[PDB]
Design a protein around this ligand. Structure first.
Ligand code: R8H
Ligand code: R8H
Lengths: 305, 305
């Protein structure tokens, strides 16, 4: 029993984290097989970050300008190329601790674990959601660039995020492992607007199923409602609209608790209109949206790695 | 910037987790050097758990009644002894992945990371506090017994918790690694009363400093107060009393933010009496007490392992 913001065990990712230095810029890299992946702005001075020309900065650089450390082990760079916002450094040594992995681009609402690192060394692990405006509400300091986000399916590590920037509003922006930014962001220090954030409705519903599973049932009401009626209300409160895809994904939780999705929808409807009245659900006085339906199943059924 | 419930990286603990079977009871063990540590009730049937005589049950058992698996690999038990509520199984093989470690008994209010395991296999990691009544509010299912809690102090793993049972009220109880229970609990399936829980005042103050560091300053008021005056209020709301030791521990945060401890105390005083009035601090609508002063410093200054 109980319910926590649970992260994946980080061990398989810890053995991939390295330190990358170019000139006086140091940040984190990911060592898989004989390639080290890192943010391309490693080739920038702090000055360059205002208006960087990544082309002309990169031409002025050779293989030996790049220092790669895995612990006290020096890796030798024998090749370098820029793929969108990521640098790939080919090194002389394949990482003997390379796990089974894949590169995935996640969708808004999906969750992942972040291994926050400084100078190639792990500091902490926490679970995050990709917000609908493509930011993450992380915990990152100077030198955390190159930290990664991941999911584990069985023995396979799915890398979905590399950390690049803090925006002037103190939220976080980065790329997939192919170096394409999530959202409309660029790797330049200039004012950048994230769009309005919205609540990930399907995740809030997943969390209400989790509450019922854990004995918190007070919010369960007499009423029902329709998708269309539910969605009119959701859009007033800055909730994401609910699709047939969301209803299909909540099927297993529906079947476990004996509560039809639309019934859970009516319950949520009342909470938006009337609030929680200074009651709590699973020890929180707000509606939580950083658990997927898969996270709830994983935690309440005991899935291992 | 930002602030998250951050757990320690779990890799050094992941390589110590094994599966221990005795008859048809299977749970988690910790393999350090040539000893496997596990809850002693592994020798119990479900039936035995109501009123176990551990001496008598252990006498009926020989070394070969104990199956130890690390992944695919069967380890051979060549010795067994009971130390309080823990079984120590001597095995033919020292764990090659034994980290630098210590056994510590922690105090109420201290935090640690839990590596939740099933069948010797890591499922997830989360941070929590030892409550003042010596329970933890965990997330554990059947088969989680023998899961451990730990702190990392540079290269050294401090094991402080082994999970044993869920109480009828859905909170968690266990031992230190010498097998002494935290709190008045016994390893028996019988109704057991946890004390009244209290809010860990020094941790709430640490979290308010974290809020100020992160730009949440609305709660900062004109007023001051004395310890004695502050404590009369705290005891009415089920807060732990604040001692000179707590004030001394908050000194560095006080010095960093330029806000005197007693000033922060007056600010907390108002929030207890007037509540938060819709507003949130660091995304929460309740006062958080599962960050120590050291947790805040670690996260806001960027300490690695
Ligand atoms: C970086 O890309 C990174 O850490 N970004 C993520 C981040 C930053 C702040 C808060 C949260 N997340 C760069 C790389 C780098 C490192 C060293 C020298 C130059 C560039 N690291 C930074 O810390 C950058 C970005 C913000 C910043 O002030 N900065 C330069 C810096 C670094 C250290 C001390 C002062 C200034
Ligand atoms: C183990 O002590 C354990 O998992 N305890 C912690 C915990 C935390 C949250 C929820 C439940 N338990 C025991 C050990 C065990 C395992 C298998 C067979 C016998 C004993 N595991 C349990 O799951 C205990 C506690 C609840 C339960 O059902 N149970 C005994 C049991 C299990 C299965 C069938 C009958 C009885």
């Amino acid at each position: 029993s109980g319910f926590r913001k649970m992260a994946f065990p980080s061990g398989k990712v810890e053995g991939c984290m390295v330190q990358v230095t170019c000139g006086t810029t140091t940040l984190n890299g990911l060592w898989l097989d004989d390639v080290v992946y890192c943010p391309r702005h490693v080739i920038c001075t702090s000055e360059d970050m205002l208006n960087p020309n990544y082309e002309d900065l990169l031409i002025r650089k050779s293989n030996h300008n790049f220092l790669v450390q895995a612990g006290n082990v020096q890796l030798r760079v024998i090749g370098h190329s820029m793929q969108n916002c990521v640098l790939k450094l080919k090194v002389d040594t394949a990482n003997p601790k390379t796990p089974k992995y894949k590169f995935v681009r996640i969708q808004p609402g999906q969750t992942f674990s972040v291994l926050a690192c400084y100078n190639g060394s792990p500091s902490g692990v926490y679970q995050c959601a990709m917000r609908p405006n493509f930011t993450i509400k992380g915990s990152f300091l100077n030198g955390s660039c190159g930290s990664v986000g991941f999911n584990i399916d069985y023995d396979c590590v799915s890398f979905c995020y590399m950390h690049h920037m803090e925006l002037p509003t103190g939220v976080h922006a980065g790329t997939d492992l192919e170096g394409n930014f999530y959202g409309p962001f660029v790797d330049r220090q200039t004012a950048q607007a994230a769009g309005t954030d919205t609540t990930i409705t399907v995740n809030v519903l997943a969390w209400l199923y989790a509450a019922v599973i854990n004995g918190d049932r007070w919010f369960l009401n007499r009423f029902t409602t329709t998708l269309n009626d539910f969605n009119l209300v959701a859009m007033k409160y800055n909730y994401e609209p609910l699709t047939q895809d969301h209803v299909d994904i909540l099927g297993p939780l529906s079947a476990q608790t004996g509560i039809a999705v639309l019934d859970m929808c009516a319950s949520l409807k009342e909470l938006l209109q009337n609030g929680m009245n200074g009651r709590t659900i699973l020890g929180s006085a707000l509606l939580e949206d950083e658990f997927t339906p898969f996270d709830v199943v994983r935690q309440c059924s005991g899935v291992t790695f």
